[PDB]
CSV table of N, CA, C and O and ligand atoms in Angstrom, one decimal:
chain,number,residue,atom,x,y,z
A,1,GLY,N,14.9,-53.3,-32.3
A,1,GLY,CA,15.2,-53.9,-33.6
A,1,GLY,C,15.7,-52.8,-34.5
A,1,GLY,O,16.7,-52.1,-34.2
A,2,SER,N,15.1,-52.7,-35.6
A,2,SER,CA,15.6,-51.8,-36.7
A,2,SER,C,15.5,-50.3,-36.4
A,2,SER,O,16.1,-49.5,-37.2
A,3,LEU,N,14.8,-49.9,-35.4
A,3,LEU,CA,14.7,-48.5,-35.1
A,3,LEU,C,16.0,-48.0,-34.4
A,3,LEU,O,16.4,-46.8,-34.4
A,4,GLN,N,16.8,-48.9,-33.8
A,4,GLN,CA,18.0,-48.7,-33.2
A,4,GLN,C,19.1,-48.5,-34.3
A,4,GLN,O,19.7,-49.5,-34.7
A,5,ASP,N,19.3,-47.3,-34.7
A,5,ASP,CA,20.3,-47.0,-35.7
A,5,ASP,C,21.6,-46.9,-35.0
A,5,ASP,O,21.6,-46.5,-33.8
A,6,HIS,N,22.7,-47.2,-35.6
A,6,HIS,CA,24.0,-47.1,-34.9
A,6,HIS,C,24.5,-45.7,-34.8
A,6,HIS,O,25.3,-45.3,-35.6
A,7,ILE,N,24.0,-45.0,-33.9
A,7,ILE,CA,24.3,-43.6,-33.6
A,7,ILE,C,24.4,-43.5,-32.1
A,7,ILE,O,24.2,-44.5,-31.3
A,8,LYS,N,24.7,-42.4,-31.6
A,8,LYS,CA,24.8,-42.2,-30.2
A,8,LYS,C,24.3,-40.8,-29.9
A,8,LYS,O,24.4,-39.9,-30.7
A,9,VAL,N,23.7,-40.6,-28.7
A,9,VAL,CA,23.3,-39.3,-28.3
A,9,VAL,C,24.5,-38.6,-27.7
A,9,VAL,O,24.6,-38.5,-26.4
A,10,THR,N,25.4,-38.3,-28.5
A,10,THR,CA,26.7,-37.6,-28.1
A,10,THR,C,26.4,-36.3,-27.5
A,10,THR,O,26.6,-36.1,-26.3
A,11,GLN,N,25.8,-35.4,-28.2
A,11,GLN,CA,25.3,-34.1,-27.6
A,11,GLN,C,23.8,-34.2,-27.3
A,11,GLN,O,23.4,-34.0,-26.2
A,12,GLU,N,23.1,-34.6,-28.4
A,12,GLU,CA,21.6,-34.8,-28.4
A,12,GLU,C,21.2,-35.0,-29.8
A,12,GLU,O,21.6,-34.3,-30.7
A,13,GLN,N,20.3,-36.0,-29.9
A,13,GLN,CA,19.8,-36.4,-31.2
A,13,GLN,C,18.4,-35.9,-31.3
A,13,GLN,O,17.9,-35.7,-32.4
A,14,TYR,N,17.7,-35.8,-30.2
A,14,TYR,CA,16.3,-35.5,-30.2
A,14,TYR,C,16.0,-34.0,-29.9
A,14,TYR,O,14.8,-33.7,-29.7
A,15,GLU,N,17.0,-33.1,-30.1
A,15,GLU,CA,16.8,-31.7,-29.8
A,15,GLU,C,15.9,-31.0,-30.8
A,15,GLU,O,15.4,-29.9,-30.6
A,16,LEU,N,15.7,-31.7,-31.9
A,16,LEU,CA,15.0,-31.3,-33.1
A,16,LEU,C,13.5,-31.3,-32.9
A,16,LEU,O,12.7,-31.5,-33.9
A,17,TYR,N,13.0,-31.1,-31.7
A,17,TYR,CA,11.6,-31.1,-31.4
A,17,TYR,C,10.9,-29.8,-31.5
A,17,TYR,O,9.8,-29.6,-31.0
A,18,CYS,N,11.6,-28.8,-32.0
A,18,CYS,CA,11.1,-27.5,-32.2
A,18,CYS,C,10.5,-27.4,-33.6
A,18,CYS,O,11.1,-28.0,-34.5
A,19,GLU,N,9.5,-26.6,-33.8
A,19,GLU,CA,8.9,-26.5,-35.1
A,19,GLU,C,9.5,-25.4,-35.9
A,19,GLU,O,10.0,-25.6,-37.0
A,20,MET,N,9.5,-24.2,-35.3
A,20,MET,CA,10.0,-23.0,-35.9
A,20,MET,C,9.2,-22.6,-37.1
A,20,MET,O,9.4,-23.0,-38.2
A,21,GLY,N,8.1,-22.0,-36.8
A,21,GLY,CA,7.1,-21.6,-37.9
A,21,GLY,C,7.1,-20.2,-38.2
A,21,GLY,O,8.1,-19.6,-38.5
A,22,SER,N,5.9,-19.6,-38.1
A,22,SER,CA,5.8,-18.2,-38.5
A,22,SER,C,5.6,-17.3,-37.2
A,22,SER,O,4.8,-17.6,-36.3
A,23,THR,N,6.5,-16.3,-37.1
A,23,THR,CA,6.4,-15.4,-36.1
A,23,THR,C,5.3,-14.4,-36.4
A,23,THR,O,5.5,-13.5,-37.4
A,24,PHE,N,4.2,-14.4,-35.8
A,24,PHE,CA,3.0,-13.5,-36.0
A,24,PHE,C,3.3,-12.2,-35.3
A,24,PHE,O,2.7,-11.2,-35.6
A,25,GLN,N,4.3,-12.2,-34.5
A,25,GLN,CA,4.7,-11.0,-33.8
A,25,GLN,C,5.7,-10.2,-34.6
A,25,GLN,O,6.0,-10.6,-35.8
A,26,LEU,N,6.0,-9.0,-34.1
A,26,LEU,CA,7.0,-8.1,-34.6
A,26,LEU,C,6.5,-7.0,-35.6
A,26,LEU,O,5.5,-7.2,-36.3
A,27,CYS,N,7.0,-5.9,-35.4
A,27,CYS,CA,6.8,-4.7,-36.2
A,27,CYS,C,7.8,-4.7,-37.3
A,27,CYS,O,9.0,-4.8,-37.1
A,28,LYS,N,7.4,-4.4,-38.5
A,28,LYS,CA,8.2,-4.5,-39.7
A,28,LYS,C,9.3,-3.4,-39.8
A,28,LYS,O,10.3,-3.5,-40.4
A,29,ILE,N,9.0,-2.3,-39.1
A,29,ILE,CA,9.8,-1.1,-39.2
A,29,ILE,C,11.1,-1.3,-38.4
A,29,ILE,O,12.1,-0.8,-38.7
A,30,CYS,N,11.0,-2.0,-37.3
A,30,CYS,CA,12.1,-2.1,-36.4
A,30,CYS,C,12.6,-3.5,-36.2
A,30,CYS,O,13.7,-3.8,-35.9
A,31,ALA,N,11.6,-4.5,-36.3
A,31,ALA,CA,11.9,-6.0,-36.2
A,31,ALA,C,12.1,-6.4,-34.7
A,31,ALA,O,12.2,-7.6,-34.4
A,32,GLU,N,12.2,-5.4,-33.8
A,32,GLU,CA,12.5,-5.7,-32.5
A,32,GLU,C,11.2,-5.6,-31.6
A,32,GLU,O,10.9,-6.5,-30.8
A,33,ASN,N,10.4,-4.6,-31.9
A,33,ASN,CA,9.1,-4.5,-31.2
A,33,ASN,C,8.0,-5.1,-31.9
A,33,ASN,O,8.3,-5.6,-33.1
A,34,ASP,N,6.9,-5.2,-31.3
A,34,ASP,CA,5.7,-5.9,-32.0
A,34,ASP,C,4.6,-4.9,-32.3
A,34,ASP,O,4.8,-3.7,-32.0
A,35,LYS,N,3.6,-5.3,-32.9
A,35,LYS,CA,2.5,-4.5,-33.3
A,35,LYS,C,1.7,-4.1,-32.0
A,35,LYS,O,0.8,-4.8,-31.5
A,36,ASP,N,2.1,-2.9,-31.5
A,36,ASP,CA,1.5,-2.4,-30.3
A,36,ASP,C,0.4,-1.4,-30.6
A,36,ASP,O,-0.5,-1.3,-29.8
A,37,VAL,N,0.5,-0.7,-31.7
A,37,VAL,CA,-0.5,0.3,-32.0
A,37,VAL,C,-1.1,0.1,-33.4
A,37,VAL,O,-0.4,-0.3,-34.4
A,38,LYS,N,-2.4,0.3,-33.5
A,38,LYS,CA,-3.2,0.2,-34.7
A,38,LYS,C,-3.7,1.6,-35.1
A,38,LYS,O,-4.4,2.2,-34.3
A,39,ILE,N,-3.3,2.0,-36.2
A,39,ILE,CA,-3.7,3.3,-36.8
A,39,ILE,C,-5.1,3.2,-37.3
A,39,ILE,O,-5.3,2.5,-38.3
A,40,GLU,N,-5.9,4.0,-36.8
A,40,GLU,CA,-7.3,4.1,-37.3
A,40,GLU,C,-7.5,5.3,-38.1
A,40,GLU,O,-6.9,6.4,-37.9
A,41,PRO,N,-8.3,5.3,-39.2
A,41,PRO,CA,-9.1,4.1,-39.6
A,41,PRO,C,-8.4,3.3,-40.7
A,41,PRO,O,-9.0,2.5,-41.4
A,42,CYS,N,-7.1,3.5,-40.8
A,42,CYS,CA,-6.2,2.9,-41.7
A,42,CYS,C,-6.2,1.4,-41.6
A,42,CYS,O,-6.4,0.6,-42.5
A,43,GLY,N,-5.9,0.9,-40.4
A,43,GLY,CA,-5.9,-0.5,-40.1
A,43,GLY,C,-4.5,-1.0,-40.2
A,43,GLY,O,-4.2,-2.2,-40.3
A,44,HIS,N,-3.5,-0.1,-40.1
A,44,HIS,CA,-2.1,-0.5,-40.2
A,44,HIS,C,-1.6,-0.8,-38.8
A,44,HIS,O,-2.0,-0.2,-37.8
A,45,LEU,N,-0.6,-1.8,-38.8
A,45,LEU,CA,-0.2,-2.3,-37.5
A,45,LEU,C,1.3,-2.1,-37.4
A,45,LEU,O,2.1,-2.3,-38.4
A,46,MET,N,1.7,-1.7,-36.2
A,46,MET,CA,3.1,-1.4,-36.0
A,46,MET,C,3.3,-1.1,-34.5
A,46,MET,O,2.3,-1.2,-33.7
A,47,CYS,N,4.5,-0.8,-34.1
A,47,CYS,CA,4.7,-0.4,-32.7
A,47,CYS,C,4.7,1.1,-32.5
A,47,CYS,O,5.1,1.8,-33.4
A,48,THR,N,4.2,1.5,-31.4
A,48,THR,CA,4.2,2.9,-31.0
A,48,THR,C,5.7,3.5,-31.0
A,48,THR,O,5.9,4.7,-31.3
A,49,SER,N,6.6,2.6,-30.8
A,49,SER,CA,8.1,2.9,-30.8
A,49,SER,C,8.5,3.5,-32.2
A,49,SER,O,9.2,4.5,-32.2
A,50,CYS,N,7.9,3.0,-33.3
A,50,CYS,CA,8.2,3.5,-34.6
A,50,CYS,C,7.3,4.7,-34.9
A,50,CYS,O,7.7,5.7,-35.4
A,51,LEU,N,6.0,4.5,-34.5
A,51,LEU,CA,5.0,5.5,-34.8
A,51,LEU,C,5.2,6.9,-34.2
A,51,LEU,O,5.0,7.9,-34.8
A,52,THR,N,5.7,6.9,-32.9
A,52,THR,CA,5.9,8.1,-32.2
A,52,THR,C,7.0,8.9,-32.9
A,52,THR,O,6.9,10.1,-33.2
A,53,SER,N,8.1,8.2,-33.2
A,53,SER,CA,9.2,8.6,-33.9
A,53,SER,C,8.8,9.3,-35.2
A,53,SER,O,9.3,10.4,-35.6
A,54,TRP,N,7.9,8.6,-35.9
A,54,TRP,CA,7.5,9.1,-37.2
A,54,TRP,C,6.6,10.4,-37.0
A,54,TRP,O,6.7,11.3,-37.7
A,55,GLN,N,5.8,10.4,-35.9
A,55,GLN,CA,5.0,11.6,-35.6
A,55,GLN,C,5.9,12.7,-35.1
A,55,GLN,O,5.6,13.9,-35.2
A,56,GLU,N,7.0,12.4,-34.5
A,56,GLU,CA,8.1,13.4,-34.1
A,56,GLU,C,8.8,13.9,-35.3
A,56,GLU,O,9.7,14.8,-35.2
A,57,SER,N,8.5,13.3,-36.5
A,57,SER,CA,9.0,13.7,-37.7
A,57,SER,C,7.8,14.2,-38.6
A,57,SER,O,7.9,14.4,-39.8
A,58,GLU,N,6.7,14.5,-37.9
A,58,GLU,CA,5.4,14.9,-38.4
A,58,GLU,C,4.7,13.7,-39.0
A,58,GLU,O,5.1,13.2,-40.1
A,59,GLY,N,3.7,13.2,-38.3
A,59,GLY,CA,3.0,12.0,-38.7
A,59,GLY,C,2.0,12.2,-39.9
A,59,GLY,O,0.8,12.2,-39.8
A,60,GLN,N,2.7,12.4,-41.1
A,60,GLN,CA,2.0,12.6,-42.3
A,60,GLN,C,1.4,11.3,-42.9
A,60,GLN,O,1.6,11.0,-44.1
A,61,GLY,N,0.7,10.6,-42.1
A,61,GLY,CA,0.2,9.3,-42.5
A,61,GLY,C,1.1,8.2,-41.9
A,61,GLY,O,2.1,8.5,-41.3
A,62,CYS,N,0.7,6.9,-42.1
A,62,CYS,CA,1.5,5.8,-41.6
A,62,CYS,C,3.0,5.9,-42.1
A,62,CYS,O,3.2,6.3,-43.2
A,63,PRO,N,4.0,5.5,-41.3
A,63,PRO,CA,5.4,5.6,-41.7
A,63,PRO,C,5.7,4.9,-43.1
A,63,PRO,O,6.7,5.3,-43.8
A,64,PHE,N,5.0,3.9,-43.4
A,64,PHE,CA,5.2,3.1,-44.6
A,64,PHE,C,4.5,3.8,-45.8
A,64,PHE,O,5.2,4.5,-46.6
A,65,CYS,N,3.3,3.8,-45.8
A,65,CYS,CA,2.4,4.2,-46.9
A,65,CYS,C,2.0,5.7,-46.9
A,65,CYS,O,1.8,6.3,-47.9
A,66,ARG,N,2.0,6.2,-45.7
A,66,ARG,CA,1.6,7.6,-45.4
A,66,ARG,C,0.1,7.8,-45.6
A,66,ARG,O,-0.3,8.9,-46.0
A,67,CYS,N,-0.7,6.8,-45.4
A,67,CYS,CA,-2.1,6.9,-45.5
A,67,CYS,C,-2.7,7.4,-44.1
A,67,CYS,O,-2.0,7.5,-43.1
A,68,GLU,N,-4.0,7.6,-44.1
A,68,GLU,CA,-4.9,8.2,-43.0
A,68,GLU,C,-4.5,7.8,-41.6
A,68,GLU,O,-4.6,6.6,-41.2
A,69,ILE,N,-4.1,8.8,-40.8
A,69,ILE,CA,-3.9,8.6,-39.4
A,69,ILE,C,-4.9,9.5,-38.8
A,69,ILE,O,-4.8,10.8,-38.9
A,70,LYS,N,-5.9,9.0,-38.1
A,70,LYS,CA,-6.8,9.8,-37.3
A,70,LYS,C,-6.7,9.5,-35.9
A,70,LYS,O,-6.3,10.3,-35.0
A,71,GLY,N,-6.9,8.2,-35.5
A,71,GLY,CA,-6.8,7.8,-34.2
A,71,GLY,C,-5.9,6.6,-34.1
A,71,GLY,O,-5.5,6.1,-35.1
A,72,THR,N,-5.6,6.1,-32.9
A,72,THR,CA,-4.8,5.0,-32.7
A,72,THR,C,-5.3,4.2,-31.5
A,72,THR,O,-5.8,4.7,-30.5
A,73,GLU,N,-5.2,2.9,-31.6
A,73,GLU,CA,-5.6,2.0,-30.5
A,73,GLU,C,-4.5,0.9,-30.3
A,73,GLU,O,-3.8,0.7,-31.2
A,74,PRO,N,-4.4,0.4,-29.0
A,74,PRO,CA,-3.5,-0.7,-28.7
A,74,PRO,C,-3.9,-2.0,-29.4
A,74,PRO,O,-5.1,-2.2,-29.7
A,75,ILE,N,-2.9,-2.9,-29.7
A,75,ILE,CA,-3.2,-4.1,-30.3
A,75,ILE,C,-3.1,-5.3,-29.3
A,75,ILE,O,-4.0,-5.7,-28.7
A,76,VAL,N,-1.8,-5.8,-29.3
A,76,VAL,CA,-1.5,-6.9,-28.4
A,76,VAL,C,-2.0,-8.2,-29.1
A,76,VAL,O,-3.2,-8.6,-28.9
A,77,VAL,N,-1.2,-8.7,-30.0
A,77,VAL,CA,-1.6,-9.9,-30.8
A,77,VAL,C,-1.3,-11.2,-30.0
A,77,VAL,O,-0.7,-11.1,-28.9
A,78,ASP,N,-1.7,-12.3,-30.6
A,78,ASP,CA,-1.5,-13.6,-29.9
A,78,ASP,C,-0.2,-14.2,-30.3
A,78,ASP,O,0.1,-14.3,-31.5
A,79,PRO,N,0.7,-14.5,-29.4
A,79,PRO,CA,2.0,-15.1,-29.7
A,79,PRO,C,1.8,-16.5,-30.2
A,79,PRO,O,2.3,-16.8,-31.3
A,80,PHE,N,1.1,-17.4,-29.5
A,80,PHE,CA,0.9,-18.8,-29.9
A,80,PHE,C,2.3,-19.6,-29.9
A,80,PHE,O,2.6,-20.3,-28.9
A,81,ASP,N,3.0,-19.4,-30.9
A,81,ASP,CA,4.4,-20.0,-31.1
A,81,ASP,C,5.1,-19.2,-32.0
A,81,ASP,O,5.1,-19.3,-33.2
A,82,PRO,N,5.8,-18.1,-31.5
A,82,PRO,CA,6.6,-17.2,-32.3
A,82,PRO,C,8.0,-17.7,-32.5
A,82,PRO,O,9.0,-16.9,-32.8
A,83,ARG,N,8.2,-19.0,-32.3
A,83,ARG,CA,9.5,-19.6,-32.3
A,83,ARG,C,9.9,-20.1,-33.7
A,83,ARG,O,9.3,-19.7,-34.7
B,101,ZN,ZN1,8.4,-0.8,-34.8
B,102,ZN,ZN1,-2.0,3.5,-43.2
């Protein structure tokens, strides 16, 4: 009945089934890598890709804020839907 609008699935009408929400992934410094390393006891999150580079430039604190770097641990966050 009335749900049949006069259109056609020429290419595709129902392709719009993607949400595209919030990407919980990614490192702010590079945007390509994700939060792989957590700087302790700072609690800052980024990828070792950026962090090593910064320490190769003397790791005078996190690359952003330059706050306390003592230790580092791996992260690996949950993707869920990074689409
Ligand atoms: Zn990065
Ligand atoms: Zn920090």
